[PDB]
Design a protein around this motif. Structure first.
Motif, mmCIF file in Angstrom:
data_model
loop_
_atom_site.group_PDB
_atom_site.id
_atom_site.type_symbol
_atom_site.label_atom_id
_atom_site.label_comp_id
_atom_site.label_asym_id
_atom_site.label_seq_id
_atom_site.Cartn_x
_atom_site.Cartn_y
_atom_site.Cartn_z
ATOM 1 N N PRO C 53 36.215 20.645 2.815
ATOM 2 C CA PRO C 53 35.058 19.854 2.383
ATOM 3 C C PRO C 53 35.345 18.346 2.291
ATOM 4 N N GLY C 54 36.576 17.938 2.610
ATOM 5 C CA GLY C 54 37.016 16.535 2.542
ATOM 6 C C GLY C 54 37.635 16.239 1.195
ATOM 7 N N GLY C 55 37.460 15.018 0.689
ATOM 8 C CA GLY C 55 38.082 14.606 -0.583
ATOM 9 C C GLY C 55 38.370 13.121 -0.604
ATOM 10 N N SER C 56 39.549 12.705 -1.057
ATOM 11 C CA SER C 56 39.913 11.265 -1.140
ATOM 12 C C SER C 56 39.882 10.642 0.263
ATOM 13 N N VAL C 57 39.153 9.538 0.413
ATOM 14 C CA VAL C 57 39.101 8.749 1.676
ATOM 15 C C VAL C 57 40.502 8.207 1.993
ATOM 16 N N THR C 58 41.233 7.685 1.003
ATOM 17 C CA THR C 58 42.550 7.044 1.265
ATOM 18 C C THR C 58 43.549 8.150 1.626
ATOM 19 N N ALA C 83 33.720 19.083 6.761
ATOM 20 C CA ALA C 83 32.732 18.164 6.156
ATOM 21 C C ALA C 83 33.423 16.909 5.618
ATOM 22 N N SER C 84 32.655 15.826 5.522
ATOM 23 C CA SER C 84 33.054 14.603 4.928
ATOM 24 C C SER C 84 34.332 14.074 5.598
ATOM 25 N N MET C 85 35.407 13.913 4.839
ATOM 26 C CA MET C 85 36.690 13.464 5.438
ATOM 27 C C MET C 85 37.268 14.545 6.395
ATOM 28 N N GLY C 86 36.942 15.826 6.218
ATOM 29 C CA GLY C 86 37.331 16.874 7.177
ATOM 30 C C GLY C 86 36.767 16.600 8.571
ATOM 31 N N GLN C 110 28.063 9.414 4.560
ATOM 32 C CA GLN C 110 28.645 8.164 3.992
ATOM 33 C C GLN C 110 29.522 8.525 2.802
ATOM 34 N N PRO C 111 30.538 7.685 2.501
ATOM 35 C CA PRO C 111 31.403 7.915 1.349
ATOM 36 C C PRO C 111 30.669 7.735 0.011
ATOM 37 N N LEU C 112 31.262 8.302 -1.044
ATOM 38 C CA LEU C 112 30.804 8.206 -2.452
ATOM 39 C C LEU C 112 31.819 7.357 -3.207
ATOM 40 N N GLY C 113 31.393 6.770 -4.311
ATOM 41 C CA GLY C 113 32.314 6.027 -5.180
ATOM 42 C C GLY C 113 31.793 5.921 -6.590
ATOM 43 N N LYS C 131 32.971 -2.223 2.422
ATOM 44 C CA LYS C 131 33.975 -2.558 3.465
ATOM 45 C C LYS C 131 34.638 -1.264 3.970
ATOM 46 N N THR C 132 34.900 -0.295 3.088
ATOM 47 C CA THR C 132 35.519 1.005 3.458
ATOM 48 C C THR C 132 34.556 1.809 4.341
ATOM 49 N N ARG C 133 33.255 1.782 4.043
ATOM 50 C CA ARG C 133 32.247 2.475 4.887
ATOM 51 C C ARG C 133 32.230 1.832 6.279
HETATM 52 C C1 LIG Z 1 33.987 13.514 1.890
HETATM 53 O O1 LIG Z 1 35.115 13.938 1.987
HETATM 54 C C2 LIG Z 1 33.618 12.472 0.821
HETATM 55 C C3 LIG Z 1 33.415 13.132 -0.526
HETATM 56 C C4 LIG Z 1 34.584 13.970 -0.931
HETATM 57 C C5 LIG Z 1 32.227 14.041 -0.418
HETATM 58 C C6 LIG Z 1 34.655 11.411 0.856
HETATM 59 O O2 LIG Z 1 34.426 10.754 2.051
HETATM 60 C C7 LIG Z 1 34.502 10.401 -0.306
HETATM 61 O O3 LIG Z 1 33.666 9.538 -0.262
HETATM 62 N N1 LIG Z 1 35.367 10.513 -1.278
HETATM 63 C C8 LIG Z 1 35.383 9.612 -2.434
HETATM 64 C C9 LIG Z 1 36.410 8.484 -2.259
HETATM 65 O O4 LIG Z 1 37.533 8.723 -1.904
HETATM 66 N N2 LIG Z 1 35.950 7.302 -2.600
HETATM 67 C C10 LIG Z 1 36.691 6.050 -2.577
HETATM 68 C C11 LIG Z 1 36.950 5.553 -3.995
HETATM 69 O O5 LIG Z 1 36.075 5.656 -4.851
HETATM 70 O O6 LIG Z 1 38.043 5.072 -4.185
HETATM 71 C C12 LIG Z 1 35.894 4.958 -1.924
HETATM 72 C C13 LIG Z 1 36.765 3.717 -1.821
HETATM 73 C C14 LIG Z 1 35.433 5.404 -0.582
HETATM 74 C C15 LIG Z 1 34.519 4.394 0.054
HETATM 75 C C16 LIG Z 1 35.687 10.393 -3.700
HETATM 76 C C17 LIG Z 1 34.623 11.432 -3.931
HETATM 77 C C18 LIG Z 1 35.693 9.465 -4.879
#
Ligand SMILES: *C(=O)[C@@H](C(C)C)[C@@H](O)C(=O)N[C@H](C(=O)N[C@H](C(=O)O)[C@@H](C)CC)C(C)C
Ligand SMILES: *C(=O)[C@@H](C(C)C)[C@@H](O)C(=O)N[C@H](C(=O)N[C@H](C(=O)O)[C@@H](C)CC)C(C)C
Ligand SMILES: *C(=O)[C@@H](C(C)C)[C@@H](O)C(=O)N[C@H](C(=O)N[C@H](C(=O)O)[C@@H](C)CC)C(C)C
Ligand SMILES: *C(=O)[C@@H](C(C)C)[C@@H](O)C(=O)N[C@H](C(=O)N[C@H](C(=O)O)[C@@H](C)CC)C(C)C
Ligand SMILES: *C(=O)[C@@H](C(C)C)[C@@H](O)C(=O)N[C@H](C(=O)N[C@H](C(=O)O)[C@@H](C)CC)C(C)C
Ligand SMILES: *C(=O)[C@@H](C(C)C)[C@@H](O)C(=O)N[C@H](C(=O)N[C@H](C(=O)O)[C@@H](C)CC)C(C)C
Ligand SMILES: *C(=O)[C@@H](C(C)C)[C@@H](O)C(=O)N[C@H](C(=O)N[C@H](C(=O)O)[C@@H](C)CC)C(C)C
Ligand SMILES: *C(=O)[C@@H](C(C)C)[C@@H](O)C(=O)N[C@H](C(=O)N[C@H](C(=O)O)[C@@H](C)CC)C(C)C
Ligand SMILES: *C(=O)[C@@H](C(C)C)[C@@H](O)C(=O)N[C@H](C(=O)N[C@H](C(=O)O)[C@@H](C)CC)C(C)C
Lengths: 184, 182, 181, 182, 182, 183, 182, 182, 181
Positions: C53-58, C83-86, C110-113, C131-133
């Motif tokens: 399902p993905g997870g941390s972008v970094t 999904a997502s980062m997957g 799109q990413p979440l934060g 900037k990360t998006r």
């Molecule tokens: C898919 O894998 C996304 C979620 C898990 C659904 C993933 O892309 C995502 O956005 N993850 C978020 C993340 O790593 N956010 C960082 C952050 O807040 O540091 C942003 C910098 C990304 C633009 C998690 C859910 C916080």
């Protein structure tokens, strides 16, 4: 909540001047109180204006519509006055005031947005809940279109995300008729 | 979990037996897929035996197992013990044609999938369209695997539908009730 | 997990299994497996199975950069859901070697934060997310052959793709159809 | 965490690679310091490779690692993957001069330290003085490692400051952005 | 708590409003209703608003701010204890020449706080709203104090604690209220 | 916690007579360190032992179990502060063999009077209070002996939290040298 | 809380205010309102403030303190049980010559407490505020007692318990009220 | 709590009866002190009747009631029903000499005070010395009120000491066991 | 509910006190205050105490018991539902000849319960207090019922459930109240 003796609480004293104060989330209990106050004021005098102050983040859509329909039903004009913030269903009720008698104070904020919902269980149940949410959004947009003079297409586009308006922007949008600016 | 000189599951894996005795989540799916890939690497032509006692779980986790079964060269036998419900019954039906079994007192349950949607009206419509498309995909494959019409699968899975081993055979979810040889 | 444990035995065949959310621990393990496999043989393909399902972008970018850094081609094979980062990592496989099984799902979004505190802190957090998006969309654009503008539009909401739709979109090269027995 | 015939980390440690992929607390510092002392005892000449993906953590745990890197004879190369933030970026900048790297999409974040102080006015004064003196020490070392003035480090670390790999190189936190091997 | 009318209702009779709590929508609703009531009783006589508050909701503070400017009566503001955050904003909103603090009363000015969780596009909208709200707060404080918007911005970056005499020098109040003659 | 071929990393360092304290000091941690010291003495009663200290301290009695074992065994115990040696950690740093107590340049040392608790009947509270005061006198007497500072100066300097740089710790007598990096 | 009015409302009729709790903004808002009410009833007659309090908020304490010094009537203070922390400060705030304790009442003086969390720069601002507030408390206690600021600083470093007689000798009260008939 | 309009307690207060049927904290002490001051203001000569059914509570709260009893002119009769333990027995013994009663099956319990001390060695010393001085004060007053030696009070209060009404009279804690009406 | 008084206040006007709860210091404080009030109103007229109680605090029970015996007016006791533990003790405490139960009311007698924690010396003192309190309860129940202390001790080792008629036979009440008319 202070007392006034002529014994009223401060809100009951204001109700004597046909003022209703909405300063909370909108749930069925708040809707029940505001509908009861509107029916009471109509029974006291069917001709004189009512003043609804709105400082609300919104709440239940159906609770909002109980208030909305009671406002349109009763003979008296209901003036709406935004102080602080009218967001979500709050903004909808602000726009629902008598045409020409919708106001905001200069630093009052208005926020418009599509409704939220939930759907859990079997695929068939989700389809029914989803159809109800979609039909409710179409109802909210058609009424906002009628109240503001904006097209359905623009209301849909402008409510996809949280949309924060100043008092002046809300007047430009047609959510209110005037900004009440200090006069004394 | 006893040891053999291997844990009991590792010992059975040597005889190309995989035991599913839990709900299906990404962890369980990752383990079963890895065991299927391992067994194919050991011998691409000998049958694999998948025992299923499962109430189901994640639809996507189930499809990871389903696609791995169809992908590998070895026939995968499916043997229902206890209960094969929801995604468990889906995987039971997914075994090699003619090698899908239930023990005589095993139960099979078929049912429409469940889902969830929370947030903006636009998010809920996207989630609803996804749930509808995934239900159509599940029903289409169950139809292909059982020889029942999509129409019949849809009608029969509206509510919980409990089948005996013999009823599961008549439905086309399995090929044979595996009766004691002795 | 039968016991080499089953994953350790597949690693002998240059197979890495991603079957969980991506956090710093999972990224640390997958990066370590890629570096180990490159050290064993710098020319032989690696196979990364993705059900995530993905997870941390970094954490995702730690895996992404290690994949592009090492000499061996990394094949990506989606089973279940990417999904997502997957989906981002699925798209990051060696050119011509990105796959999904027929009933596997791909989801782009799109990413979440999060941002908490003073207006000045919220501004900094928001600019970092924006900037990360842009970085995610630039790479997805490069990997799919879609315009940045189309990626931006198609990731605003949850976007679910079949294996065939993922191939048409350019996230994978082929659907792996079962071989005739 | 897979096995090789060693867990994957132990196998990489054989090649003088240390993986930091977590927050930095006393337990993590104790482990990394121990691996550095172990690698020096095996060979005092050959480079060590410290991969950093860390949000940071304890300042004093960070300094335990920092002082061990400077104390041992081997050069410690630092390689940023994913994110080197807070104390992680401090340790990235502490690698052997000319041997500090980030992968192209890796992020670096620099920020003033955080702390806490509860109790009597006299206790809060001692804690506040300690925090201010610790920030001066961090800024002095970052200034030395980057070639930036203490004044610039102070200004640039008041708020969260996010840098790309290229910006981290231009700042003097790393020497090179690592390009793919082919 | 005590009866004479409860003590607050007795003070209301003499056109005194006591703010001795955080500002939320409930508190704003009560203070706005008191202001409207006192105007209806007499549109020409002064109202006295005592402020001991750590602040709270910005929009709830603006409900009170706008009601003060809207009504005909002059609203005197009297700071006892602390007027911080939105409390200091409301202290500065009193009728020009009739804003007071007691000698040992404290005033604190600071930029607003917020939160945002969810999709990048949602965080951008939340961020822009907080930035625009801060410009609005800074514009009004500039108008109320005679200080420049640029000075208000700089002086509210961090928590800014003022004595009553400093608050007067700043233009947040007109006079430090000295003891009555015995 | 990696493996070396089979030892965990700490067991491999123990082979080289290195003991790593990188945690709070409780009875379990004291039991481990005392066991390592007794083992290392039995292996070789002459060769130095190296005790790395990164510790916020912990139990006074647990600390004294380690202290008394260090002074009891024949081998010299070197102490090397990395990160922070606070509370009972600074006490154990000062307890290393004279001339063999060290800190790395950015290591912190913190000295402070002990903490305690007493609940129940006035008579119980008197006994708890007397024990805490007598324990503080014991800690002060040993720190005086280990640093060459007077009991009066230790008492004054530990009333409140007292943060020392590695260099300040050397000047105070808590360590003998700052180990400076070689180019 | 019996009726006669509740018992406190009946005593308020005789210009008596009962403080028998911690001091927070709600308690301060009540006591200030009672002082304002009593001044409006009669600006010449003494007010009687009984204090049994462990203290509480410093700023809530200063709201009461400044209101006592502001109003025309003398405010007598009578300690029963314990006047600790901010309670001792308010006991010393009574009209000179009209500050009392009953023979078994206790007085406790101590430096203020506070809390600072976050960035080094925030902790510095919070520490400076706490230190300035202690200087303000010490300056006023010096004026109230006739003791030097240096003695007050030294005597309030730790919890300092005084008998009624010791509190009189310190200058916190003017007289111990000894039983006239018992 | 029934009505007669008075609540039952208010109706008894009209006849100069105060009911203590709870633990003693600052709130209960505030109420009882307020009732004593009210009764003296109504009539400075007529006896007051204090019924005591209490496990005790705060020592300083108890001294607020004790000192108010000794301060006012009216005799305060004490009447133990159920149990007077800890500070309840102390207040029972503090009644007007000759007018301290227990009902025949009422229990009186005397015991040394309890306390707590947490934090630095220096803080524990101060807390300990305070608890010791408070025990000496309680023992001295019990000695004065019972005619027992301080030495005997100390010995008899080391552990929970349970007394019958008759034993409490023998001890000097009460004057008489109250005999029934005819 | 209100009468033009809450329902309990209206019954108090007719010299009726209702106990329909556990007995704690708060309930004893209220019932003692009601007895003192009714004695002061009229020292000659009977009081009526309805008892439906599982019992509670022994010392709270004795606060009520001693007040009943102290005041001049006869206190009638009427058991409805259940008078157990200290409730049965208070039922037995009514004026002799004016202690009643309704026909389906239950009475339960039982030894007291207690708790002791901490040092051996503290536990010995608590045990002796509990033993002496049981002896006190048994002596008063003997005096009120006409049963021997030895029989009461025997009969109260375990929970002992009595019908209204068994309660009368035991001497805990004088009469079972028959329906009017
Ligand atoms: C898919 O894998 C996304 C979620 C898990 C659904 C993933 O892309 C995502 O956005 N993850 C978020 C993340 O790593 N956010 C960082 C952050 O807040 O540091 C942003 C910098 C990304 C633009 C998690 C859910 C916080
Ligand atoms: C603004 O007032 C909205 C939220 C409170 C933020 C409000 O408009 C809203 O969406 N409320 C939701 C609601 O009532 N949804 C109903 C429902 O689920 O019953 C849907 C039918 C509307 C499409 C709350 C949050 C459930
Ligand atoms: C049987 O195994 C079902 C349940 C466990 C009873 C299973 O098939 C199921 O519906 N699982 C649900 C699921 O995975 N739903 C997905 C989803 O939300 O991702 C929908 C897309 C399927 C239409 C679990 C309970 C969420
Ligand atoms: C980045 O890694 C920082 C946080 C983890 C974000 C880190 O540098 C930091 O400030 N850590 C804090 C810390 O160790 N503070 C010490 C302390 O209070 O003991 C101060 C002395 C630092 C000046 C943690 C979060 C307390
Ligand atoms: C002082 O009164 C501040 C805090 C209460 C300490 C107050 O000014 C403040 O920032 N309040 C925050 C606020 O209302 N924020 C809104 C919001 O996020 O809804 C922003 C739009 C204002 C920029 C709240 C209480 C988080
Ligand atoms: C530093 O290590 C101190 C604390 C961990 C901060 C340590 O010296 C300390 O005071 N520990 C305390 C302790 O062991 N106290 C005992 C006790 O109460 O049993 C006293 C006898 C010491 C005088 C812990 C925190 C209780
Ligand atoms: C005695 O009453 C003290 C405590 C209640 C024991 C009281 O004087 C005190 O220190 N109160 C603290 C306080 O108000 N601190 C403020 C603050 O942190 O806002 C400081 C700024 C005052 C120096 C309470 C415990 C927070
Ligand atoms: C009986 O009433 C005692 C307790 C309720 C069992 C009571 O006398 C007592 O000791 N109370 C304690 C108390 O007030 N202690 C103070 C204090 O710590 O402030 C001591 C100073 C008195 C020696 C309570 C239980 C803390
Ligand atoms: C019936 O009412 C009994 C229980 C509530 C069932 C009651 O008689 C009883 O034993 N109550 C206990 C009690 O008051 N015990 C005291 C005490 O521990 O203080 C003993 C001294 C009595 C011998 C309660 C339940 C503790």
């Amino acid at each position: 909540i202070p007392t006034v003796i002529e014994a009223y609480d401060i809100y009951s004293r204001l109700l004597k001047d046909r003022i209703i104060m909405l300063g909370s989330q909108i749930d069925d209990n708040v809707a029940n109180s505001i509908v009861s106050q509107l029916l009471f004021l109509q029974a006291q005098d069917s001709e004189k204006d009512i003043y609804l102050y709105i400082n609300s983040p919104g709440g239940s859509v159906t609770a909002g519509f109980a208030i909305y329909d009671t406002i349109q039903h009763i003979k008296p004009d209901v003036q709406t006055i935004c102080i602080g913030m009218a967001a979500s269903m709050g903004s909808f009720l602000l726009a629902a005031g008598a045409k020409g008698k919708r106001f905001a104070l200069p630093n009052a904020e208005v926020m418009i947005h599509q409704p939220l919902g939930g759907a859990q269980g079997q695929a068939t149940e989700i389809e029914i809940a989803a159809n109800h949410i979609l039909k409710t959004r179409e109802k909210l947009n058609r009424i906002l279109s009628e109240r503001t003079g904006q097209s359905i297409e623009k209301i849909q586009k402008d409510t996809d995300r949280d949309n924060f308006l100043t008092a002046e922007e809300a007047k430009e949008y047609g959510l209110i008729d005037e900004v009440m600016v200090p006069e004394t």
